Each structure stands twice: as C-alpha cells, then as structure tokens.
Design a protein around this ligand. Structure first.
Ligand code: CLA
Ligand code: CLA
Ligand code: CLA
Ligand code: CLA
Ligand code: CLA
Ligand code: CLA
Ligand SMILES: CCCCCCCCCCCCCCCCCC(=O)OC[C@H](CO[C@@H]1O[C@H](CO)[C@H](O)[C@H](O)[C@H]1O)OC(=O)CCCCCCCCCCCCCCCCC
Ligand SMILES: CCCCCCCCCCCCCCCCCC(=O)OC[C@H](CO[C@@H]1O[C@H](CO)[C@H](O)[C@H](O)[C@H]1O)OC(=O)CCCCCCCCCCCCCCCCC
Ligand SMILES: CC(=O)O[C@H]1CC(C)(C)C(=C=C/C(C)=C/C=C/C(C)=C\C=C\C=C(C)/C=C\C=C(\C)C(=O)C[C@@]23O[C@]2(C)C[C@@H](O)CC3(C)C)[C@](C)(O)C1
Ligand code: KC1
Ligand code: KC1
Lengths: 172, 141, 89, 147, 164
C-alpha cells in the first residue's frame, strides 16, 4: 500500500508485475501511460546505453578499428559522431537501425493492442541461456538487465557530459 | 508467432502451405487480398526476370538485342494472360522440360522452395548490381 | 459512446492518457506550454531584428519553432484541465 | 489506369464494401500521399529540373543523377544548416533562362515577382511546395488506422 | 475546526492559543492541510536558515570560493555565489526534490493517504501519538520562532552591517 522507495508516498498500483519494480514512480507516469510502453521504453533506453557507455569508453581508451578508415584518424568519442557521418559509417548504421526500429514498431503497436508480447521481447537469444529456466530465474535475469540498464543510462550521461564539459577522455 | 520476426504474430493467410512461407508479412499486405495467388505470380515473375538480368549483366561485359527479349517475353505473357486470373498454380505455364514430373509433392514443394529463394535472392542482387553500377560506373572490382 | 450530456464532457474524451491525469497537473503543464510559446515568439522576434542573425532565415531556430507549438498545446491542456476538474479528476 | 479499372472489376480484385467505408485510412493516405508526398515530389522536380532551367542549366533524365541542384549538395539538409539553401538568390538583373545574373539558392522567401518575367520566383514556389508538403504529411497523421 | 484536526494551538507558555484572527482555516477549509504542510516547510527551512547564518559567520566550507576573503560577513553569500555555481546547485536539487518528491507528496496529502509534513523520517519519532503530538508542537514552536529569527537576522545585518 506504501511505496518501498519512498515510504511516505502510496504505492502507484500499476507496477504489480514488472520485475524491476521499486514502487518508485512518484510522478505516476504508470498511472497515465501504458506500462507495456513504459517498460519497453525503459528496456530500450537501457540496452542502448549499455552499448553506448561501452562504446564511448572503448573509443576514449584507444581502440580504433584497424585499419582506421579515412577521416577518423585524430578523433575522440566526443567528435566521432560528425566524423563518421562524413565518412559514411553512421549512415549505414542509421539505415539498419531504421529497418530494425520500423519492424519493432509493429511489435510495439501490436503489443499495445493485445498480442501477449512481453515488453522488451524479441526472439534474440541465440546462445541458449534460457533452456527451460524457471520463471523465478527468468524474472531474476530480467531484473539484472533492467538494473544494469538503469546504471548505464546514468553512467553514459555522466561520461558524455564530463567528457565534453571538462574536455577530457574517460579516465578523467 | 512469425518465424522470420518472432516478436510479431503470424499472419493469418500465411500458414505454411506455400513455398517460401517464413511468416514474413509485417505490413499486413496479405490481409486484404482474397488469395496470394496473384502476388506469388508477381513474386516469381519479378524473381525470374531478376535472375535473367543478373546473368545478362554478367555476359554484357564479360565477352538492340534486348528488344527481341522484351518481344519474346511479351509473347509468352500474352498467350498465358488468363492464367494469372484463372486461379491456377502461380508461376506454372507448363514451361518445364519434363523434369517437373518427379518425386512426390514434398519434392515438388522443395523445387518451388528452391525457385522462390532464388527469386528472392536475385531481386536483392539486381537491385544491388544496378545501383552500384549507376553510382561507381565500374563493371566489377 | 462519446456522446455526453450536461455541463461537462466525461474524462474519456481526452484520450487514454490525459483522462487519468489530475486537473492541477494539466493546468500547470498548460502554463508551461504557454510560457514556452510566449518565450519562443518573443525570442524569434528579437532574432528577426538583430542585424547579424536574420540573413537567409537564420532567425529561424528549431527550438523556437518547436517551442512556439506549445501555443496550441497550452490551449488544449487548459481545456483538458477544466474537464478533469469538472470530473473530479 | 484503364487496366486498373478493368482489374478492380475482376472478382478477386473487387474491393469489399468495408474497404470503401474506411474513412480513416483514406484521409491518412490522401493527406500524406496524394497531397503531401506529391507536393514533396513536385518540390523535387522544380529544385532539380525547373530552377536549373531558369538558371541556364539543362538537367534532364540523362544527367540528373550526376548533377546536384545545389553546390553544397544535400549535406546542409542533413546537418540542419538549412540557411545554405537561401544564400544567393537570382539578382534583380538576372536574364531569365540564362546563367547571367543567376543565383544558386533553391529555397527562398523573397516575395514579389522576378523583375523580368513579372512572375513568382521558382525558389519561392519550391519553398512553398516543400512547406505545403510537410504540413500535409503531418496532417495525414491524425486518424486511427491499424496501428 | 483546524485546532481539532491539527496540532499547534499553543503559545510560548504552553497555554491553549487558538490563533486565527482572519479565520483563514474556515474561509479556506479545504486548504488547511496545505496550510500545515507549508507552515512546517516554512518552519523547517527557517530553522536551518538561522543556523546557517550564524555558523557561516565563523566557519566556511574550506574552499577558496567560499572563503572569508571572498564573501565578507554572511550577507554577500547570496549575490556573490549566483554566477559562481553553488546557488545554482542548490536551486537544482531543491527544485528537483520539490518537483519529484514534494509535489507528489502534497497531492497524496490532498487525497488523504499521507500526513502533512511527513517525509518519512520516522527513526527518532516516538509512538503513543500524544508523545508524537508533543514533538510536533515543539517543531512548530521552534519553527514559528525561527521564522521571525531569520527575518530579524537578515534584516538587521543589512541596515546595520554588523555580524551577529
Ligand atoms: C528514461 C527511461 C526510463 C523509463 C521509460 C522508465 C520507466 C519506468 N521505471 Mg525506471 N528508472 C530509470 C529510467 C526509466 N524508467 C533510471 C535511469 C533509473 C535509475 C535511477 C530508474 C529507476 C527505477 C526504479 C527503482 C523503479 C523504476 C520503475 C519504472 C516504471 C515506473 C513508471 C514511472 O513512474 O516512470 C516512467 C516515466 C519516466 C521515466 C519519464 C521521465 C521523464 C521526465 C520528464 C523526467 C516505468 C516502467 C519501477 C518499476 O520498474 O516497477 C516495478 C521501479 O520500482 N525505475
Ligand atoms: C470552441 C473550441 C473548442 C472546444 C472547447 C473543444 C472541446 C473539445 N474538443 Mg475539439 N476541436 C475544435 C474546437 C473545440 N473543441 C476545433 C476547432 C477542432 C479542429 C477542427 C477540434 C478538433 C478536435 C479533435 C480531433 C478532438 C477534439 C476533442 C475535444 C474534447 C476534449 C478536449 C481536448 O481537446 O483535449 C485536450 C488535449 C489536447 C487538445 C492536446 C492536443 C494538442 C492539439 C495540437 C491542440 C473537448 C470537448 C477530442 C474529442 O472530442 O475526443 C472524442 C478530440 O479527439 N477536438
Ligand atoms: C519520415 C518520417 C515518418 C515517421 C517517423 C512516421 C511515423 C508513423 N507513421 Mg507515417 N508516413 C510518412 C512518414 C513518417 N511516418 C510519410 C512521408 C507518409 C506519406 C504521408 C506516411 C504515411 C502514413 C500512413 C498512411 C500511416 C502512417 C502511420 C505512422 C505511424 C505508425 C505508428 C507505428 O508505430 O507503426 C508501426 C510501424 C510501421 C507501420 C512501419 C513504418 C514506420 C515508418 C516510420 C514509416 C515509413 C516512413 C518513411 C516512408 C520511411 C523512411 C523513414 C526512415 C525509416 C528512413 C507512425 C507515427 C500510420 C498511422 O497510424 O498514423 C496515425 C498510418 O496509417 N504514415
Ligand atoms: C498514398 C496512397 C494513395 C494515393 C496516392 C491515392 C490516390 C488516389 N486515390 Mg486513393 N485510396 C488510398 C490510398 C491512395 N490513394 C487508400 C489507402 C484507400 C482506402 C482507404 C483509397 C481509396 C480510394 C477510393 C475509393 C478512390 C480513391 C481515388 C484516388 C485518386 C483520387 C482522384 C485524383 O486522381 O485526384 C488527385 C488530385 C490531386 C493530386 C491534386 C489535389 C487537388 C486538390 C483540389 C488540391 C486542393 C487542396 C490544396 C492543397 C489546399 C486547399 C487550398 C486552400 C487555400 C483553399 C487518386 C489517384 C479515387 C479514384 O479516382 O480511383 C480511381 C477513388 O474513387 N482512393
Ligand atoms: C509531382 C511530381 C512530379 C511531376 C508532376 C513531374 C513532371 C515532370 N517531370 Mg519531374 N521530377 C520529379 C517530380 C515530378 N515531375 C522528381 C521527384 C524528380 C527527381 C528529383 C524529377 C526529375 C525529373 C527529370 C530529370 C526530368 C523530369 C521531367 C518531368 C516532365 C516530363 C516527365 C515525363 O515525361 O514522365 C512521364 C510521366 C509519367 C510516366 C507519369 C508518372 C505516373 C506516376 C509515377 C504515378 C514533367 C513536367 C523531364 C523534363 O523534361 O523536364 C522539363 C525530365 O527530364 N523530372
Ligand atoms: C537554509 C539552508 C541553508 C542554505 C541555503 C545555506 C547556504 C550556504 N551555506 Mg550554509 N549551513 C546551513 C544551512 C544553509 N546554508 C546549516 C544548517 C549549517 C550548519 C551545519 C550550515 C553551515 C555552513 C558552513 C560551514 C558553510 C556554509 C556555506 C554556505 C554557502 C555555500 C555552500 C553551501 O551550500 O554549504 C554547504 C551546506 C552545509 C555545510 C550545511 C549542510 C546542510 C544541512 C545539514 C541541512 C540539510 C539537510 C537536508 C535534509 C538536505 C536535503 C537536500 C535536498 C536537496 C535533498 C551557501 C550560501 C559555506 C560558506 O562559505 O558560506 C559563505 C560554508 O563554508 N554553511
Ligand atoms: C509537477 C508534477 C506534479 C504536478 C502535480 O501532480 O501537482 C501536484 C500538486 C497539486 O496536486 C494536485 O492534487 C490534486 C488532488 O489533491 C489533483 O489530483 C491534481 O491532479 C494535482 O495536481 O501541485 C503542485 O503544487 C506542484 C507545483 C509545482 C510547480 C510550482 C510552480
Ligand atoms: C502561475 C501561477 C501558478 C499557480 C500556483 C500553482 C502552484 C501550486 C500551488 O499553489 O499549490 C496548490 C495547493 C494545493 O492545495 C489544494 O488544497 C488541498 C490541500 O489541502 C487539496 O490538496 C487540493 O486538492 C489541492 O488542490 O493549493 C494552494 O496552494 C491554494 C492557494 C490558493 C491561493 C491563491 C490566491 C492568492 C490570493
Ligand atoms: C491546483 C494546481 O495544481 O494548479 C492550478 C493553478 C491555476 C493557475 C490556479 C489554475 C488555472 C487556470 C489556467 C491554467 C489557465 C490557462 C490558459 C492557457 C495556459 C492557455 C490558453 C491558450 C489560448 C490560445 C487561443 C493559445 C494559442 C493559439 C494559437 C492559434 C497559436 O498559438 C498559433 C501558433 O501556434 C501556431 C499555429 C504557428 C506558430 O508558428 C505561431 C503561433 C504560435 C502563433 C488551475 C487549473 O487551477 C491549476
Ligand atoms: C549487408 C549489406 C551491406 C553491404 C553490401 C555493406 C557495404 C559496406 N559497408 Mg556496411 N554495414 C552493414 C551492411 C552492409 N554494408 C550493416 C548491417 C552495418 C551495421 C549497422 C554496417 C555498418 C558499416 C559501418 C560503420 C561502415 C560500413 C562500411 C561499408 C563499406 C565497406 C567498403 C569496404 O569494405 O572496402 C561497404 C560499402 C564502411 C564504409 O566505408 O562506409 C563508407 C564503414 O565505415 N558498414
Ligand atoms: C549526486 C550527484 C551530484 C554531482 C555529480 C554533483 C557535482 C558537483 N557539485 Mg553538487 N550537490 C549535490 C549532488 C551532486 N553534485 C547534492 C545532492 C547537493 C545538496 C543539495 C549538492 C550541493 C552542492 C554545493 C553547495 C556545491 C556543489 C558543487 C558541485 C560541483 C563540484 C563538486 C566538487 O568537486 O567538490 C560538481 C559539479 C560545488 C561547486 O563547485 O559549484 C560550482 C558546490 O559549491 N554541489
């Protein structure tokens, strides 16, 4: 009845499944927006930032692709966006993200009209890793994804701001 | 759920009865058609033309003649005009060399499966072969 | 379905999102959209008359165009704030 | 169009009565595709074909893939530096149909008339049609279709 | 009826002091839960403010931007730290707290599921509600006195210029 993260606010009451729940949501976006959309957005914000904070850390700590293509030679992670769109690069990344996001949009749109799809469910599990696991263990691994995703969202925002404001690379 | 896109439900008219059925209709184009006979007729014909256009672009540099080809394809499409609207088997106009009388209908299905995967591949290839011809203007290399 | 009687419509005419929002939250959002639109119009006015910032349409900023469309959003959220208040939120 | 009228009377291609009553999907397409996309495509014609022809440049089907309509060439569009397309318009002494006195801007808001032809600027018509295109494409996202 | 719904009808001698001359709690009877959540908020702010004016006049935090050479007594700590950053840092986090915590707290108070003034600090809170009610009037009386104390300190330190 009371929120766990904020034990003076009531429980938001729309978070009752949803493995990463702290009862946290004070502004009650779960009251106004569908929780299937909100968890799909949290998961997608999470696994993008998990790749992004590892890709910003790797590029700032040396580690270019070898051999380096033309136009990406003296370039850090804070200047690799515009240098890659001039080289080509992100133009092909944008093309294949677009055909993934247009196809996943039909997944999100059919999830909000039924279809029983879990938010943040694609078929992508090629290395097994869920070969008949129990639902208490499936929901535990889903909690590890949301917790690590929630950390990398705050981490990338720290890394990207500090690398541009104080003008340094990631071991500041 | 769909085979090709496992996060999507399987399309209702895309049960596993035609060749090449990977459950791939995300935009739902098959919901409004009464049958997929005319669309398979168009998928096979686009693929068979693309298969000849791939080899036609290979043997054009590795050696109006094509005006006789469009006149020859046009005579075949004129005499078999009603077969696209009869309701018959898509792609079949009886142009086989006796090889299609063969093993049972599981083998006829895998012959149609070998055609429609070659049809779908050559449409991606002739789109690629003509775009990177118009941009770079190299034959190959 | 969406027909209604009396002095105020029910909450469901606001769509599936704003029908659940409080009237005070929709009221404060409306002032926030009105202030962003009024700031965007006034700052695009001073960018038009600045002699180094108007040439070839350089007075057009993307955040001031997007900010100026808070005007119709301030109209609608204050209408929606009234409807939630009449419906007891 | 004469084959399509024959085709959509054949028994497998006759559309159902519910397809004719689908008001939400028809307005969405007719605002986007019929109005907005065609206005975007007509902006594609007059930027690529008509405004070079008024600038003394021939752009036809033989050379339109290898001749950019602007010297900056579509990188100010994707970087958001859209003021490059309004940099130098045609002069007040531009001889129409020739390159003498001719500008390179493709999307202006000049207003008034070209002084020789006493007619609208083609760069104003292109920026008109492009702004009309965006408004109608947006307007075709109002109604509830399958999504 | 605010004196029976809420606690704090006391004076400095502990006698019963029903103090509402303008009768604002009867003119604005739905607002009296907001009136107590904001009286405590004004009270708990002024109690930290009166300590933070006196403790600044002897101790600074050890940075050079906060040093005694930069800000002379305590009254220049506001204006000589606006562009510096520390006033913008507390404006962010208090304003983030008031948007994310306090604004959902005052709507849960209006719905009736939390008490006004309660932000979850129940560690040293006694049970046996009258004992808690005695702690709230001690918070209120020290709060109401500090609201005049920070009014007195910040006014007298400007017209007279003296510290403490
Ligand atoms: C930015 C993307 C994002 C999204 C879409 C969500 C969405 C959600 N979170 Mg998560 N959260 C996030 C980032 C996000 N979060 C981050 C970075 C952290 C670490 C601080 C958390 C920490 C957190 C906890 C500890 C819990 C949640 C919970 C929730 C759910 C509650 C709904 C709600 O009230 O807020 C959704 C709305 C927004 C985030 C909008 C924010 C934008 C404004 C303008 C700022 C919802 C699925 C609860 C849950 O999962 O249910 C059990 C829960 O217990 N969140
Ligand atoms: C006299 C002015 C007036 C008033 C008081 C209303 C009142 C209403 N309109 Mg209407 N409307 C009007 C003129 C008006 N309308 C005009 C001139 C148009 C364009 C032709 C519309 C187009 C319109 C649509 C499409 C819808 C409404 C809806 C509504 C109802 C919900 C409140 C709302 O708009 O959501 C508040 C929130 C917003 C407006 C956010 C959207 C921001 C946009 C861009 C503004 C409310 C009864 C809704 C309805 O009746 O649902 C069944 C609805 O879907 N209106
Ligand atoms: C380029 C930007 C763009 C974007 C972001 C969208 C986005 C959308 N369109 Mg729109 N569409 C566009 C351009 C765009 N469209 C143009 C220029 C036209 C002609 C006017 C249309 C014609 C159109 C129609 C007729 C309909 C939509 C609908 C929709 C909505 C589908 C909701 C969903 O999640 O569907 C699930 C996902 C899909 C259907 C996959 C396609 C989604 C992409 C974004 C559309 C393709 C855009 C463009 C042609 C491709 C290039 C962009 C990029 C990928 C490189 C979504 C808001 C539907 C709607 O409900 O509107 C209210 C609808 O009925 N669109
Ligand atoms: C994007 C996809 C698309 C496109 C391009 C079209 C295009 C068309 N359809 Mg539509 N149709 C579609 C999807 C589409 N349809 C869908 C999804 C459905 C089912 C829901 C239909 C169902 C349908 C039916 C039942 C019919 C059509 C018809 C038509 C034709 C309309 C007549 C015409 O040619 O004038 C095109 C006109 C122009 C291009 C110029 C517009 C001129 C107007 C006057 C401009 C004025 C507005 C201006 C910009 C602003 C106002 C000015 C202001 C200052 C006052 C046109 C070819 C009709 C037809 O003729 O079929 C053969 C018809 O009967 N359609
Ligand atoms: C609203 C869209 C629209 C319209 C009405 C036109 C109209 C025209 N174009 Mg333009 N064009 C357009 C968009 C458009 N174009 C776009 C998007 C591009 C690429 C940027 C071009 C690039 C282009 C070039 C390079 C040329 C033209 C030419 C022409 C003229 C003859 C075309 C022809 O013979 O085709 C026959 C018509 C059809 C086959 C009907 C198509 C039915 C559709 C597909 C349905 C005609 C005035 C030619 C010309 O002579 O210019 C003066 C020419 O050389 N156009
Ligand atoms: C009304 C509250 C308040 C405000 C607005 C200020 C403001 C200021 N203080 Mg002061 N201070 C306060 C209370 C306050 N103080 C209290 C109660 C004490 C005694 C502990 C102090 C002891 C103190 C010292 C030793 C110094 C300052 C200094 C300063 C100045 C800049 C740096 C700073 O923020 O100090 C840091 C803040 C503190 C050291 C006090 C900690 C805050 C206490 C514990 C209450 C917070 C509890 C509460 C739950 C926090 C919630 C935060 C919320 C966002 C979640 C700034 C003008 C510095 C200066 O040089 O002045 C010019 C300096 O050296 N203050
Ligand atoms: C801002 C997000 C919180 C807004 C909101 O919920 O209002 C929360 C509170 C009032 O809370 C109101 O409560 C009412 C029932 O008690 C209704 O439910 C309204 O929806 C709700 O807004 O508003 C504030 O005081 C926020 C002020 C922040 C802006 C200051 C300027
Ligand atoms: C721009 C102006 C913004 C208006 C102020 C909105 C900020 C929110 C706010 O004041 O809190 C909104 C609070 C919420 O207090 C109201 O009362 C109850 C609380 O006991 C319930 O919570 C109600 O639902 C809640 O709406 O209301 C007040 O502060 C009332 C102040 C009215 C005084 C204005 C008259 C000035 C003379
Ligand atoms: C309890 C709590 O929590 O809070 C309380 C606080 C408080 C304040 C007391 C309360 C209240 C009363 C409120 C909120 C009253 C608000 C009214 C409000 C906020 C708004 C009307 C806008 C009208 C029009 C006609 C606007 C635009 C109309 C138009 C046509 C445009 O903008 C055109 C334009 O856009 C385009 C088309 C193109 C652009 O390029 C250019 C421009 C920009 C010109 C509440 C409700 O009690 C909540
Ligand atoms: C399957 C179809 C396909 C083809 C046929 C193709 C071809 C080329 N890619 Mg692309 N590509 C993808 C697909 C395809 N690529 C996918 C799925 C991704 C992940 C989203 C992707 C990402 C990148 C990045 C970051 C770069 C990149 C490049 C090249 C370039 C190499 C020339 C060479 O090898 O000498 C040739 C044209 C680099 C470049 O030079 O761009 C100018 C470059 O930096 N690609
Ligand atoms: C948890 C996230 C977090 C980060 C990442 C962060 C960062 C910085 N804080 Mg902030 N801060 C809080 C949180 C965070 N702060 C909180 C919860 C409060 C209480 C409301 C708070 C208050 C103050 C005050 C009074 C000052 C202050 C400053 C700095 C500055 C250099 C710090 C250093 O290196 O010692 C860096 C950017 C000082 C400053 O130099 O401003 C120019 C300064 O005077 N902060």
């Amino acid at each position: 009845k009371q929120s766990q993260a904020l034990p003076f606010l009531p429980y938001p009451e729309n978070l009752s499944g949803y493995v990463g729940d702290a009862g946290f949501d004070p502004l009650r976006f779960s009251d106004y927006f569908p929780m299937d959309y909100l968890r799909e957005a949290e998961i997608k914000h999470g696994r993008i930032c998990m790749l992004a904070t590892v890709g910003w850390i790797a590029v700032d700590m040396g580690l270019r692709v070898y051999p380096v293509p033309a136009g990406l030679e003296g370039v850090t992670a804070a200047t690799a966006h515009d240098a890659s769109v001039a080289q080509g690069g992100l133009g092909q990344v944008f093309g294949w993200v677009a055909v993934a996001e247009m196809a996943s949009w039909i997944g999100v749109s059919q999830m909000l009209q039924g279809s029983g799809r879990e938010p943040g469910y694609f078929g992508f599990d090629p290395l097994g890793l869920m070969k008949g696991k129990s639902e208490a263990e499936v929901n535990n691994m889903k909690l590890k994804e949301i917790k690590n995703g929630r950390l990398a969202m705050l981490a990338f925002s720290g890394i990207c701001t500090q690398s541009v404001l104080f003008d340094k690379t990631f071991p500041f | 759920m769909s085979e090709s896109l496992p996060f999507l439900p399987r399309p209702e008219k895309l049960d596993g009865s035609m060749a090449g059925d990977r459950g791939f209709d995300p935009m739902g184009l098959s919901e409004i058609q009464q049958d997929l006979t005319y669309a398979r007729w168009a998928e096979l014909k686009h693929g068979r033309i693309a298969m000849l256009a791939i080899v036609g672009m290979i043997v054009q540099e590795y050696i109006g003649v094509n005006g006789q080809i469009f006149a020859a394809i046009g005579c075949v499409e004129l005499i078999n005009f009603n077969k696209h609207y009869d309701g018959s088997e898509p792609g079949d106009i009886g142009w086989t060399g006796g090889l299609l009388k063969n093993k049972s209908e599981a083998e006829i299905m895998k012959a149609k499966e070998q055609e429609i995967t070659h049809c779908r591949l050559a449409m991606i290839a002739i789109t690629g072969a003509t775009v990177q011809t118009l941009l770079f203007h190299q034959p190959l290399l | 379905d969406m027909t209604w009687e009396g002095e105020y419509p029910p909450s469901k005419v606001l769509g599936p999102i704003m029908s659940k929002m409080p009237s005070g939250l929709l009221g404060l959002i409306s002032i926030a959209c009105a202030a962003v639109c009024a700031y965007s119009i006034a700052q695009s006015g001073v960018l038009q008359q600045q002699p180094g910032a108007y040439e070839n349409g350089s007075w057009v900023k993307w955040y001031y165009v997007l900010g100026s469309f808070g005007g119709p959003l301030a109209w609608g959220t204050h209408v929606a704030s009234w409807i939630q208040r009449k419906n007891g939120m | 169009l004469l084959f399509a009228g024959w085709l959509h009377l054949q028994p497998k291609f006759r559309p159902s009565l519910s397809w004719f009553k689908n008001n939400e999907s028809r307005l969405n397409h007719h605002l986007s595709g019929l109005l907005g996309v065609s206005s975007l495509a007509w902006t594609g014609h007059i930027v690529h074909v008509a405004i070079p022809a008024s600038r003394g440049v021939h752009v036809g089907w033989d050379n339109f893939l290898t001749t950019p309509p602007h010297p900056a060439g579509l990188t100010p569009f994707f970087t958001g530096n859209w003021t490059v397309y309004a940099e130098n318009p045609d002069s007040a002494s531009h001889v129409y149909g020739t390159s003498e006195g001719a500008g390179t801007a493709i999307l202006t808001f000049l207003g008034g008339f070209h002084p020789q032809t006493q007619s609208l600027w083609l760069s104003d018509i292109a920026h008109h049609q492009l702004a009309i295109a965006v408004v109608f494409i947006i307007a075709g996202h109002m109604y509830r279709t399958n999504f | 009826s605010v004196f029976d719904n809420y606690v704090g009808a006391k004076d400095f001698r502990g006698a019963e002091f029903k103090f509402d001359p303008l009768k604002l709690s009867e003119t604005y009877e739905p607002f009296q839960g907001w009136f107590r959540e904001s009286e405590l908020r004004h009270g708990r702010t002024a109690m930290l403010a009166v300590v933070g004016y006196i403790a600044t006049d002897f101790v600074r935090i050890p940075g050079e931007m906060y040093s005694f050479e930069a800000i002379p007594k305590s009254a220049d700590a506001h204006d000589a730290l606006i562009a510096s950053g520390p006033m913008s840092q507390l404006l962010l986090w208090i304003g983030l707290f008031d948007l994310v915590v306090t604004a959902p707290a005052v709507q849960a108070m209006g719905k009736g599921e939390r008490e006004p003034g309660d932000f979850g600090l129940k560690w040293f809170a006694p049970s046996s509600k009258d004992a808690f009610d005695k702690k709230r009037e001690a918070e209120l009386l020290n709060g109401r006195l500090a609201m005049f104390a920070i009014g007195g300190i910040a006014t007298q330190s400007v017209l007279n210029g003296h510290g403490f």
